[model samples]
Target: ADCPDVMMVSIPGTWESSPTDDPFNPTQFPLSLMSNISKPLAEQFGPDRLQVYTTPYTAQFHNPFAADKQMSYNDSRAEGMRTTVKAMTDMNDRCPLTSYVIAGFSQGAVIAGDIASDIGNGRGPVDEDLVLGVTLIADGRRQMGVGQDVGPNPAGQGAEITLHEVPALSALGLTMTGPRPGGFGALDNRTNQICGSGDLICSAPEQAFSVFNLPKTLETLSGPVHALYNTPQFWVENGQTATQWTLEWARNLVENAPHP
Candidate 1:
């Protein structure tokens, strides 16, 4: 009775989470990016059917704007990685039959992808068989096929693949690690990523040397394009926001899963 039939983990974006926040109903301290996605799921499922846990780690990117408060990209992401893994593994140990659904936005998406890859490759705390699905919204390391591309598939790769350790950006603690080595391993079929064109974070071009874009581009990173995930124009498909598509997809996974 202590465990649920399904364990769904939602990881918020940069500055959207904290260690002390509620796991089921995450506080909007920094206005979590995963609010629309998690809130509805929590409302739809009771504790017996689902256990929604939002990874409570400080999601911050090392940037000049918050040099005084922000942790390095590596530090912040690693903390998220550990906490998410801990939550999933602990639950997996206690509830071996519980299926899993992992979803995250931006920075959270990267950590989720890594965890999925580990499990898919049989290196993570939980086995791949227990994972029902993994969805990454605007994943910085978006790689087609590694995770099934949902909606419009952009020809370009994720920002991290194009910009990781690119000298200038890396100086700001936003080092973009390349694609997952094994490419989502065995979970590739279930892995899904949403990225719209023109969003630099997920659809960045290989030409970072362009002086035309870099000067004004580096000035603004998150607010303009990255924050519009819930909007219909940004990445919406068939009148559904990023959150809407993900929510519907997740609903199907939980509904169809074996409630063993």
Candidate 2:
């Protein structure tokens, strides 16, 4: 397989609908978000030298009301992980000289964060040296200080991290798996986690999981809090959307990416 100087892996968040007839069209969030950057960057470096690929998984919407929802979410996440690993590893095997940049949003962010953790801990599909950038927007399991902070620092940590020890959550398979051992390993400095203020998925407050406050917790997680990451207010002071910031970051990484 012919390979370029760089490869970008973008993963989209959950979808209200199921997988599309065309697998590649499952969700447009990742592609659309990166659209502004992918072409410009490719043109800057030449198409033959840069490549942007978006993973299209089932991306089913997470159903919070059903007991089976956790399994569905896990299945989707596993599929995405497998797809991403195969793509990156296959490329590296074919062209060990290629560098990689990875970005994901919401549920996709969770998947990407886990993978970055795996890669950082020396368990990734490709060698760490070949990975140039990792960007996660609204990661459910985001941890403070694990990566560079981008945009506003919300009041609390990611929902998964905050709820990891809650027996109720764990019993339902909604357990927070905690951070990857060693926290992104070699990619720590290059990784970025972006979370908007008041986004419960990424910044659930401590009281969010209290048994006494379960109703409010559900309200917060299921309400607008989780759905507002892409809003104009979130990006107003930041000067760009999460994808745009990721693009500029990727541009810099490509400019300085270690070459063969």
Candidate 3:
């Protein structure tokens, strides 16, 4: 609690194994694009400062059949988020003085936002004294009622700013033939979602899952099958892209941490 603990909870997007044999360990994650984003931060901070965690790819999602695995999408997504929240809460109870910053990409990014809300609302183990901010990139997914609150609300305390990669069609083309979900995607999933002008994914509709099932939720994805989170190019492009912004955001959140 006294040594200045800054924890970076890294959540994986999809299809990667858990880092440790232990389901919670993030060390065993397979190398990929979104996976690398945490490296620079770990170097800048310390390995201890980072807690990279991953979720199991859905059992129902095995390519071609992957299209029908809508339940897997909702299930895996919810679990990733809840797991991260539980871990953060555990840390808070164990190290009441520890500070935290969350970073995630794609699906993980979506979970990161959910966790951010949990923190902002004082819902979980995220104590007012320990949470810094949350940074999400290429976060294609959206939740129930996220933006209704102002930026850097109670959880982020104003440090809860976000960064996006402007989803790239060329980039998404990378996973076109692979065993991704949605059967080459019945959804419009275009790079533009992250690309700022992304009408289908980003601008489509923020909360589709609330109204229907996971299949309907998949419709909200709106783009291609590109492996957006499993490569190095994504890091090179979006790393420094969000670096200064994240740093400043961290500073603000650190300042916001309650001190005795």
Candidate 4:
């Protein structure tokens, strides 16, 4: 069967994607969560070597906590989960030997991390051995040192974990998904995470949460700490922005990945 050596699946964050958009070339060019990442990789690699695919689903994490935001965060994340699973399996079945390099941001990170977990635990679409690596930027299900921590490696866990015990968030569609059961199992070394120190989504402090606090919730959705990852002020290591670091990391993985 004809297959790319590696399938680079890049999933964008909430409101950055739509079902009708092109998977290979997303519409939200400069504004999308992973446009800096997904686009360049696709451009650099020939199709036979590395085929990049962006998961196209409604990436909208709405909030009942905030009056202006109306879509269902529950439905948003679930559609993301379902869509990504199908995409992975669709390619997996057709091209048994193509390896996977999954990368995502924010809500997208949650989906990417979950699929990596399932594959690591033997419940996924493709064999764990076929997965080259996964990089989650600001994962909602983040934990301390879960994967090889990248960037800040904040001490705090994700907002979902912090709010899991509270009854109110779950009622509002923020299910507060806790830690992974198997914890990346076979892919422990292959999976990686990057979270900003103050980004509540992935770096939420362990304390009482208040969803009704409008200002705080809004900041979490759109700000330098959470919404931005392309700049040096938001996050950087030596000289790499979050996007730059991830791009380099992914390029190295793909270039060195063994072809079947």
Candidate 5:
């Protein structure tokens, strides 16, 4: 019940469920994925100014080979978005003065970005000014002109944004259906997207988009590029994992928040 001035809502990426795993109690990786950042932030800031909560949600998608696979990710994303918005609105009702830093990785990043977009457009759970920052890692729907590009600039835009214009893909619900209108609205300045140079989720090259190149495109998305964000080598000479950079970025945001 400690009413801190800042709130951090961290959402995790995808986690494959084992055959024996509970369908309803599906696992969520965002908390563990971001522990390197959120744990340190909470420890450093404590109840003095920041309160961190990793959202609990069912982050599962049906088998990618299933007839409904294409819609699975988006469906899960929508559910997560609703849960996240509820958390934000509930917190606002309880601690009206709280500012927020909403962050996520991979699929979680897409959800967080959508929520931020709505908030920026003045259609979200909190006032636009109440959103202090947004941090996304390997966002599948990454686009230019939304946030301040950070770390290594990706060679191309996110896969969803790139493929959204394709009627076939959009009909299947496999693409993000284009960039957020007005692009993160008013919070563009406060948002940061960190993507590795070759990460296909955030930077799929144009050649990968041709229907003739579909196999290569699928290979890339399922291959090394999408799996490297958490590895130390991801940042390479930069000396930080995506998680570390996000942690530092978040720490700075909380510390720099205007204090009354």
Candidate 6:
């Protein structure tokens, strides 16, 4: 067998089954709920060159305010990431030398963020040789992490996580504030964020969950409709094709990696 080049892992949002040992398929996930975007990803990327692996058990589907659920999305992703990344590492080892890219939508987006944080922090069974990019679409919000404030990297040229905010959802009326992981708030300048004004999922009015919050509000998110990451509208406005965004988002993670 020959060594693979790039591996792309697609993590779907809440209510998704574990790809490792479940009968679930990619179409059922929450974030990739829109077939318009997900299908393009399947058509553009393939098995040999771009292997797409989708994980199902993302965030355990726990709503933060749901009194019935035992934990919040924050805790689930923080823990789910442990399992998700480990799975990716195990898969990557099977195909050594293959660059890895982790991408997800919504709940999975937050999971992707957590995984990137760990990778950036350098806590790994994963070797730097195998992983390449990290992209989070409609990525969730989070509490501020210690010593980490959201900012742009002075030298923006490497494998950094890109957070694409979706605004259409908020326009549709949804809750933007949730108990997300703090790792998200810690995103540095290296992280490229794509937020939108029209999409409600990328809500404009930032909230303060506690005292003295930094106010994570964005005047405009750079992406598109919450369900249109791979749509033509997303391409027309962002000035890049979906394939380009897909490939670059993954590539950035590979280039800017430092284990934090």
Tell me, by TM-score, which candidate is best.
4
Clashes of 5: 1
Error of 1 at 146 (Å): 2.1
Candidates' C-alpha lDDT: 0.80, 0.70, 0.42, 0.82, 0.71, 0.45
Candidate 5: TM-score?
Answer: 0.82
- Write the residue-wise lDDT of candidate 3 on 28-55 in tens digits: 5555334465454444444344433334
Instruction: Single out the weakest 10-residue window by summed lDDT for candidate 1.
Output: 215-224
Give me the runs in candidate 2 sitting further than 4 Å from their true place: 16-46, 64-71, 210-228, 236-238
TM-score of every model versus the real structure:
0.91, 0.82, 0.54, 0.93, 0.82, 0.56
What are the per-residue Cα lDDT tens digits for candidate 5 across 1-260? 34778888887666522223322233433234655666677768767588787666555543443453433555667777877798899989988888899888776788888898889999978999988889888887788767888876755688878777666443433455568777888999988888887777788676666766554554444335466666766553268777777887788889877653
Q: Cα RMSD to native, each candidate?
A: 2.3, 3.5, 11.8, 2.0, 4.1, 9.5
Better of 1 and 5 by TM-score: 1
- What is the C-alpha local distance difference test score of candidate 2? 0.70
Candidate 1 Cα misplacement greater than 4 A, ranges: 168-172, 208-223
lDDT of 6: 0.45
User: Residue 189 CA error for candidate 2 (Å)?
Assistant: 0.5
The better-scoring model by TM-score among 1 and 6 is 1
Give the lowest summed-lDDT range of ten residues in model 5.
Answer: 16-25
**Shift of residue 91 alpha carbon in model 6, Å:** 1.8
Question: Which scores higher on lDDT, 5 or 6?
Answer: 5
Instruction: Give one digit per residue, the lDDT tens place, for model 4 in 167-192.
Output: 66567566777888889989989898
